[PDB]
């Protein structure tokens, strides 16, 4: 029955839903109407993380290109407040693609669109010292703008970038996965739009809310900070859902694990860039694969244990 699909459709499904089940070469591209020249970039991560005892650690897998996840720590039994600040963890090779300046992000690429986003946690502690659980749920975060007046001479009006939907991290969602810490977790995300569309590259974004713009005037519950402009930044926001993971460790616990990630990204290169050599034509249309994508994304659970990754 699988012969009714072309090779690009099967490869796209494989890159979308199961990276770790295959050695190499997950997929090629998105088999949709567009047949231009694109570059397929695949990102993987391998990080060891330790969770302090008596604190709650939150991890967000956001559709921000070049960044793996954002994390913050809160005292146990509580949730992030207006004093919480999140910090990023980059993929290998951020500056090799987005420069070392806040206004050098588009010197290599022009547009992007996602195709897959996955994550997995593998515990590595012994069986007589751990304690706690793991909770996973998703939030529909989007990027929008806000407008407010500023009292200068002469008085003017402002318009800055804001994030809408960040309030979903303040409580556990009804559709969630909960289990013991030592069993692990493996989840995935999917597109939240009727079709795949390209997004433009933003420049100058370092913090949300930006500099000289106080919190409360933007409506955000907490702050996202990317630190120095020479190492990391925000260059866009794709059409994907954000995965929220909370790990709770009671007092006296000794917890550790290994965090992994995957990505299946398509870019539009510039003729003056080195990566233009590896570009190719995107695959043509395939209706059956496009229907199976939605069907499988609908029929899958929120998350499974690490043994079934």
């Amino acid at each position: 029955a699988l012969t009714r699909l072309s090779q690009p459709g099967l490869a796209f499904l494989k890159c979308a839903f199961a990276p770790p089940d295959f050695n190499t070469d997950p997929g090629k591209g998105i088999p949709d109407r567009f047949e231009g020249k694109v570059v397929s970039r695949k990102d993987v991560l391998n990080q060891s993380i330790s969770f302090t005892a008596g604190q709650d650690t939150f991890i967000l897998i956001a559709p921000t290109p070049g960044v793996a996840y954002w994390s913050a720590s809160v005292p146990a039994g509580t949730f992030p407040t207006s004093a919480t600040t999140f910090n990023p963890v980059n993929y290998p090779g951020f500056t090799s693609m987005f420069g070392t300046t806040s206004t050098s992000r588009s010197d290599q690429v022009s547009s992007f669109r996602y195709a897959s986003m996955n994550v997995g946690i593998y515990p590595t502690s012994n069986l007589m010292q751990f304690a706690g659980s793991i909770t996973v749920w998703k939030c529909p975060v989007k990027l929008s703008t806000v407008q407010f007046p500023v009292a200068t001479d002469p008085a003017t009006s402002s318009l800055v970038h804001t994030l809408v939907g960040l309030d979903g991290v303040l409580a556990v969602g009804p559709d969630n996965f909960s289990e013991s810490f030592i069993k692990g977790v493996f989840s995935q995300s999917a597109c939240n739009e009727p079709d795949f569309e390209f997004n433009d590259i933003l420049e100058g974004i370092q913090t949300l809310p930006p500099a000289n713009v106080s919190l409360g005037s933007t409506g955000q519950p907490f702050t996202m900070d990317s630190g120095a402009e020479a190492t990391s930044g925000v260059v866009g926001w794709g059409n994907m859902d954000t995965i929220v993971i909370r790990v709770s460790a009671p007092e006296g616990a000794v917890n550790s694990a290994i965090l992994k990630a995957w990505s299946c990204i398509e870019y539009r290169p510039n003729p003056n860039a080195m990566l233009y050599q590896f570009g190719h034509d995107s695959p043509p249309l395939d209706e059956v694969a496009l229907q199976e994508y939605r069907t499988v994304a609908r029929s899958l659970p929120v998350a499974v244990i690490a043994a079934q990754n």
């Binding site: 029955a1 699988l2 839903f17 199976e292 499988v296 079934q308």
Partner: peptide, 17 residues
């Protein structure tokens, strides 16, 4: 594993068309 689950889902979906 999980690719087996995905294959079973796809086969079940295709068997009803």
């Amino acid at each position: 594993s999980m690719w087996e689950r995905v294959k079973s889902i796809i086969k079940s979906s295709l068997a009803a068309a």
